[PDB]
Amino acid sequence: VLSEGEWQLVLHVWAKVEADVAGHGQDIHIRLYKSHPETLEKHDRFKHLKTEAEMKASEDLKKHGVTVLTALGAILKKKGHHEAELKPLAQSHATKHKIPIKYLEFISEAIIHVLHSRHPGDFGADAQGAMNKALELFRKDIAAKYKELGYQG
Ligand code: HEM
Ligand SMILES: [O]
């Protein structure tokens, strides 16, 4: 649904994330947990972290951020052909972690906020539009996989 040109913008900005995976991971999760504190209760391994300082001091959270962004980066680089990458993710998030689709909108907001926060120059109107479209397709496809697993999250 994205043009080849929009995908180049998504991957261009993604390389900036890859220059600091762990720092982007942290900032996205702190944003997620600070703005949507109910998501913290679904991150049972992190729910004891109540302050942004406790969160930034958690090397465990920092590691998880790398795991999330690494997985998300692999999806974005497939330019929409991510069936195989989304399958394990939908399986675990729908059946094991029980993360609703709405929480994916929340982390999507957080990703975009952090990207603009760190790269206001490269992440302009067009890049934001493309990244929003890419994250939108990601949630759309993963919601379809949720239903196929019988969980509508
Ligand atoms: C872009 C969106 C997301 C991506 C790419 C992502 C990716 C991952 C990956 C790769 C794992 C480890 C393997 C697995 O169990 O599937 C994981 C674990 C997990 N994710 Fe997600 N995730 C996303 C969003 C979320 C959100 C919004 C939550 C809400 C709290 C969440 C909750 C969890 C939990 C609870 C685990 C298990 C961690 C543990 O207890 O060790 N995920 N995620
Ligand atoms: O995650």
Closest CA to 107 of 75, 72, 61, 141: 72
3-state helix, strand, coil in the chain (%, to 5): 75, 0, 25
Superfamily of domain 4-148: Globins (1.10.490.10)
| Residue 93, marked binder | yes
Method: X-ray
SS3 of 3, please?
A: coil
CA–CA separation, 51 and 71 (whole Å): 26
Residues 6+ apart with CB under 8 A from 150: none
Which numbered ligand comes closest to the C-alpha of 104? Answer: 1
Q: Where are the domains of the chain?
A: 4-148
76 lines ligand 1 (CB under 6 A): no
Q: How many A from CA of 130 to the centre of ligand 2?
A: 23
| Measured CA distances, 113 to 32, 40, 89, 124 (Å) | 10, 18, 23, 12
Q: Tell how far CA 49 is from the center of its chain.
A: 19
Resolution to one decimal, Å = 1.8
